[PDB]
Design a binder for these strands. Sequence first.
DNA 1: GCAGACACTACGAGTACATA
DNA 2: TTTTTTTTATGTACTCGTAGTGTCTGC
Lengths: 348, 261, 319, 220, 329, 325
Amino acid sequence: SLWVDKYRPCSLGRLDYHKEQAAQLRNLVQCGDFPHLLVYGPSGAGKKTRIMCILRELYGVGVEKLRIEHQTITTPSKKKIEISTIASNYHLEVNPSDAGNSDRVVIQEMLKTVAQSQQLETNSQRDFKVVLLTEVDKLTKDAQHALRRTMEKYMSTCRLILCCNSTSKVIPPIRSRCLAVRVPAPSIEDICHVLSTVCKKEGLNLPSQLAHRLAEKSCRNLRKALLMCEACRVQQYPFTADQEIPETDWEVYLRETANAIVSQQTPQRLLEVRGRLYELLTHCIPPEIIMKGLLSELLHNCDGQLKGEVAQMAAYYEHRLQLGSKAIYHLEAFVAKFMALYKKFMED
Amino acid sequence: MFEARLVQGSILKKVLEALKDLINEACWDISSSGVNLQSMDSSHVSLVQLTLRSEGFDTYRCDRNLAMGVNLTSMSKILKCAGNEDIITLRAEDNADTLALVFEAPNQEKVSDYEMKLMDLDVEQLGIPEQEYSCVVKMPSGEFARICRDLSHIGDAVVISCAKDGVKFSASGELGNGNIKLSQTSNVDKEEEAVTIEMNEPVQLTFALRYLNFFTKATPLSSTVTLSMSADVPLVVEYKIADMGHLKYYLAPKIEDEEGS
Amino acid sequence: HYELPWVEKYRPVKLNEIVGNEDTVSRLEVFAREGNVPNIIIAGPPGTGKTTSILCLARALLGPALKDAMLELNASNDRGIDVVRNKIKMFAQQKVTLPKGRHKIIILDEADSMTDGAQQALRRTMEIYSKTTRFALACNASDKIIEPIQSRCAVLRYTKLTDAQILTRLMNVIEKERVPYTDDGLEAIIFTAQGDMRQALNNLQSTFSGFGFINSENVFKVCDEPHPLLVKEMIQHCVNANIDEAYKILAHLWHLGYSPEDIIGNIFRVCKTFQMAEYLKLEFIKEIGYTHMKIAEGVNSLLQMAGLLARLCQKTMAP
Amino acid sequence: ICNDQFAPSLRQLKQQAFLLHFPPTLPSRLVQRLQEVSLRQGMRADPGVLAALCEKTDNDIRACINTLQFLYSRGQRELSVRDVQATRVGLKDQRRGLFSVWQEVFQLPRASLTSASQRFYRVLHAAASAGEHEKVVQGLFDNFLRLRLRDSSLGAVCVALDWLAFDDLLAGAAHHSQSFQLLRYPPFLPVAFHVLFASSHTPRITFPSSQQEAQNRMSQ
Amino acid sequence: AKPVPWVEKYRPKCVDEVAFQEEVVAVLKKSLEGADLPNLLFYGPPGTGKTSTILAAARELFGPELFRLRVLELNASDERGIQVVREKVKNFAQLTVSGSRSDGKPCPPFKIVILDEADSMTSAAQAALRRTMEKESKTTRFCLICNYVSRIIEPLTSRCSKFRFKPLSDKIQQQRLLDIAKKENVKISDEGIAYLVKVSEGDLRKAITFLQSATRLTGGKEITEKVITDIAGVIPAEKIDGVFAACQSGSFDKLEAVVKDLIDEGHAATQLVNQLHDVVVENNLSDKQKSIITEKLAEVDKCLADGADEHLQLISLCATVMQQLSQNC
Amino acid sequence: KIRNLPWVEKYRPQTLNDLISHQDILSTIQKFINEDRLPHLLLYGPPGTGKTSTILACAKQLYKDKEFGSMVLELNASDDRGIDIIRGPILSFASTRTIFKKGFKLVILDEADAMTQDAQNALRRVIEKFTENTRFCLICNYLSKIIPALQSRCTRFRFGPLTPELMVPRLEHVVEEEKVDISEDGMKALVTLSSGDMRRALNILQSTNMAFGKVTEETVYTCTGHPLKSDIANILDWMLNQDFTTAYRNITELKTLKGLALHDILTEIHLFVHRVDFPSSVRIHLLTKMADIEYRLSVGTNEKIQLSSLIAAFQVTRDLIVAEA
DNA sequence: GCAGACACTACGAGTACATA
DNA sequence: TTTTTTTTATGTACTCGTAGTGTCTGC
Ligand SMILES: Nc1ncnc2c1ncn2[C@@H]1O[C@H](COP(=O)(O)OP(=O)(O)OP(O)(O)=S)[C@@H](O)[C@H]1O
Ligand SMILES: Nc1ncnc2c1ncn2[C@@H]1O[C@H](COP(=O)(O)OP(=O)(O)OP(O)(O)=S)[C@@H](O)[C@H]1O
Ligand SMILES: Nc1ncnc2c1ncn2[C@@H]1O[C@H](COP(=O)(O)OP(=O)(O)OP(O)(O)=S)[C@@H](O)[C@H]1O
Ligand SMILES: Nc1ncnc2c1ncn2[C@@H]1O[C@H](COP(=O)(O)OP(=O)(O)O)[C@@H](O)[C@H]1O
Ligand SMILES: [Mg+2]
Ligand SMILES: [Mg+2]
Ligand SMILES: [Mg+2]
């Protein structure tokens, strides 16, 4: 077991940060008439930890005993699709985006059968069941339109805890039906405190400068901070203050891709950069993260009077990428437009 | 309150399997005289006129006249799970929508009550002319079904003629022509297998084979069928049930245009 | 008895009565007189007379043997893959006693509706039995008929009928029917026909039944002026960045009851073959497609079409 | 015997069969054979009008013989140039190959036919009559950056990628809203490239493989 | 004795409990007396009470025992294809109107088909409804409910009587919230209820959810403005002033810093767009700068409605307002 | 007897004399019927203009009630109309004779634009072959979704939008048959908000009479929720006469006071943008910006930002119009 | 009288395309 | 002088393979 999973808190009273929100979430779910929840925040903030702490607070300690359940659903095109589900004796955890564009068939068929039926034992279990829809921002709007009457009709016997990163990808009919719970990313001091407590529970000594550099490089992601701290512990047991922190390959590959963009502005270099972008899209990197990494590395090379235009072009081609279906067209269009702008700026 | 009682379930099964691929929906017109059903097909080419008598049922009561329009696929699925020797009760209230079919299991132990929701189609009454026909033929139903099945292999539209000699069937198709002519087959030991000609003026009319083959599915209902033809009125196929009633099939001729040459 | 409409009543029964495409119709007259007709595929616009030419040629070739030496199939029939193998091939194998220079004729009307597999199966049964049978296909879109079938037949192409060719047949129908008329009325009928003899006969019969006289206002009280004749003017106004006249034509088409889909279809149809710069034409077509995506997605108002016209006028002033 | 060797059902045959590919017939032998046919049938024709039929039917023997059989009949003996040059008799729609369409898009015809509108309509009709539209889009996407592009400011590349994104948006909207009357505009994707990257050079067009290799690698 | 959330506990059981939608409520109350009920098309913003009004009308018209025989409710959670409209809806519309109320109240002689969430239906399935609505109008009624009337085809727009559900005004929403808080024995201050009806923006479901969650958080004590600001996700004015100071600085590094600090705090981009819009329309900027900036705000809101990335759209909006603020410097 | 029906179905023109507008087309169709020269018809136009009512009145005039089920085959978009139906029931109906009385039959194909192209291609020789026996009437809203081969075979009638001068007496007949107290401005608002549609004018009349009991201008514009002409003139005056903040406050107060929607405001401002003698460069920018704002309102987008952009599109062009002089 | 064989239609499954 | 593969979400149409099943033959 890694450090991301060994020292995860189990109850709402054991959270290192957002303690006021932990007390408010304990007071919210005590009566049992709490509405649907929409837990939103940046990745690595601790959303799933707080959802599992809410489930512990509701039911017993039996929510930690989970199992894989496989379901086969028939599409309107009569194609049988297999979907996995984390389940317990009190709740279920479904990720409908694994069905892709058929995610609506998960909502119309698999979810409603959960909602339309009451529970077997009403003493060990409570009066209601919980369904955790993971990553609802990746759902299509058809599935989110199928979600709303299921959320409204059977909310006295099935409560739902949707989890997402951005609420802009959730339609306003769904956001009107649920209470929005914001989990911000922990600050540098909170991540340093978490890493210090983890190193103390492991019997190690961690300098403050190394923990500050880990929290800075993790970009307020506690999962990546814990993984980087454990990797630094593995690669060198004496914790030096200027120890080299390991980095992900796709991030440094994105940095090298943007260096290849800014190095030369030619159609041959554009064809090489298009090959690099296919290499990035091959390894299942989402295209918005590729666009964000390209912008974050290309803004370090631009001048002060070009960064606004480059950021506006990046946002425009990101929106056009979201409207379309082939990411490589909009990615290469953004790279070509930046190459034209950079060539115009450098020759003038 | 309407309450009819079929003494056996086989005749209703044969009726609803005769009309299953033809009739879109069943309009049971209920009176004190009996049960009437005048319904066209989905193509508005054929017409079905079923008349069941009140004396054929076990018990028949009818306070006020009713007109119950119901779907046929649902009634077909209800009558599929019905025995051939059990008593089947049809019930209907005065101002309700539930037409009830009460029957017994094939194990003959438990009861079964299947309700149907009545449809609300406003259907104008189709006027049967009930006029005299220029050709009336009494022939066995099995031979008529066999000759329709044998002409279905040759063509699709069949020219049936009738005269003083007898009925005649022709199918000018792609393989070729098949002309089958029958007459005076009453010199046998059986009484059902007989061809009798009653009327005078010869007629030649062309009809579709699919509707004739749908009409021949009522062969177990009657041993002897009647064919009525004339130059203006359509083709009538009359099945006379033994002690329940009768069934009339009306089929319109096709449009045939001669060669200009 | 019921009187047929003038489209079906005045269908030509001889090949000399067919107006338009004089070279092809004259060669079909020669082939009907002599014989030994090759396999023929006639393509063209609707109402030109392709079916009439095929049926008149088959009738003049056969005569009394028309009912036994001709197989006519339409899109109303099945003509799938099991009909080319089992009915067309069996008719091509069928023995019919005919005079010299005369063959069995398999008329395949509206051959665009046939699938690609049926046309693939048609190739060898057309090529083998050509000593005894012949094929006479009629179609609108010649690209639907595959290259081997077009290679196995003579591909006759019919063009749109001219105003004089329509006027000659209309004067024949008028002198047969004793229809009073004026010259501007027949000019209006020719204008509303747009190369279609069916529409000319239908409009003439509608005007004669509704009013009993053929002038311009009696024609235009029941018939309508064509859509692209004003869409070309509004596209020409959009080319010169004149938004007021373009919106005047757009509002005139809007108040006549035309849907945004029909209007933008005529706009794309005019802009596809308009005479302007090629890069400007591509920008116009891309803006039309961007507007048509919004029209199809649900938003379709006069403001959207006016915004499309404004974007087309902006594309001119922005090189 | 087949007409398209690149069918998906024949590839396993192509690894095992004695692959004999037919070139188009020589115009001289075809003109001589049509001259012999016309002399046997008693009809007079100069070799120039026979070469015009040969170039009209794209060296099709059967189409040329059927066209001569219709055009001769018995009314006249001498064939005229304007009868063959007319589009009413003998013209047929050919299915263009993918490489012929890409060569027509990326290369100008060598030197009337010099007007840009005729080339516009010719490229549009060739790309429409070729079929397999997505393969043409993939070939244009994979071959337009390999040329010696004169647009050093990359404006032509940007507007070509805008046209490709327009094609992608139209395909998504037609497959989303079930409105397939938006499928008349992506036929103008190849002809747009003909306005952008028309050159008098000799480009080496390769078959598109990047969008299928990337899709296979993403699936794995 | 199970607890139930307040959005379903205070759903309008009858048509008299529906708030602020006076025209459609008056139409349905006339139809309760015996007037000719036409076909209905309810459209408007979320949370305005389109589903509750027609369910209350159906419960008043048919009672408890005739809801399963006279009401067919189809929504986007079930399959509504072309075959569902052609088979299920047409066969329901062709049924007889039988069954009477056992409590002696009058019953209307028609059925009701509630096609809730009619935006998600295709154009072919909507085109199959036309002669079903026209031909079977003697024995059934139709009520299409949607949020956008542009996604419903113009024949179905023409066949139905259109009612637009307005967002609830602050008077009616505040009165309903105070009645709910009085019935639940919870006390809320005037500043708290003013900030609540400011935050909810005419969404009464959001207001009831916020009131219930503030009651559960505080335990039943006095609800102040601070808990409403905590639970409403409202960005503090210090962050907005820091963003505007970073734009007035003219340096893109401080702009990236404040955008990353707002993203890492998990603030929704729609709330940031609303607060930046209020600050822009309520300052002393020039009309051209305000014009360009509000146009960029509208474009950014449209892009976020299409599921674009929050960080890139916010950095584009911040770059635009930074350019406008540094143009006059 | 009294019936519980919507007023768009209770008041339907059962005869051809009860329709109002298309007098030349209806006179021609009446002379087709009286001379027994009825061709295959193609009725096209915007919705609510009376095409289905026209063909149902013609079918009831042609055929009696004792034979109407055997002579008329009416199929629409709620029925399955695939190519197996064209090859099946429609071809068998067209190719066979009648049952009761000799005569020509009628196949009404309502919503003919919803048919597939295979069915439309199969219908061509069914229409042409059995012209003597049966007649076909195709009715559509969009003529582009009907193939040109079917448009050639059927003579087409454009059932255009109903003019408000001819829409008034039918509404007066409906009012006098329903005992409705209506003023002149109520009738004017009805025929303004209908916009060539008698469905929407009856629906709005019934909705206003149920909601308020009287039909005036204020009651119609309150029940429909449409803004008045004075409100649109005030919005345009505020957007052209003062700065961003005061115009924003006044339009926001006007929208909150009367509960207006931005779609109807955009439509009426678009109608006003052509009556105002703007420069041609200003009008192009205004039309492009208003089309963009109308497109942004089709999704889950906050309407206050779009109202600010609607103000912004005019605040951009204020100084341009003034300095143009 | 009952087991084996024959063709029969209804039904399940795979594939393509949808524009001018 | 140059060739592999499944996604788009329904709806329709085509084509082909398979399985109960009514009916005919024979001892
Ligand atoms: N060239 C013509 N000369 C005389 N009458 C014509 C001519 N073309 C068409 N017509 C008339 O129009 C009717 C229809 O002609 P068709 O041959 O059926 O049209 P078509 O060329 O087949 O077009 P499509 O593609 O089948 S709709 C004929 O019956 C004539 O009455
Ligand atoms: N006008 C209203 N009067 C009283 N309660 C209301 C009103 N509008 C909303 N509510 C409350 O908010 C809840 C949600 O109402 P709904 O009718 O579901 O809203 P809605 O119109 O369906 O929103 P959408 O468009 O479906 S997301 C109801 O159950 C009520 O508790
Ligand atoms: N000309 C008219 N005269 C009288 N009432 C009319 C007229 N046009 C429409 N109506 C009314 O509108 C109702 C429906 O008209 P329809 O016959 O459906 O019109 P339509 O133009 O065929 O509509 P579409 O295009 O099929 S939605 C009628 O029953 C009348 O109540
Ligand atoms: N209060 C806390 N104390 C210590 N570690 C935590 C705390 N909250 C979260 N973590 C750790 O940070 C990581 C956050 O991941 P997760 O809980 O899945 O949130 P998200 O879903 O936002 O990524 C988890 O691996 C968890 O172990
Ligand atoms: Mg034809
Ligand atoms: Mg709702
Ligand atoms: Mg209609």
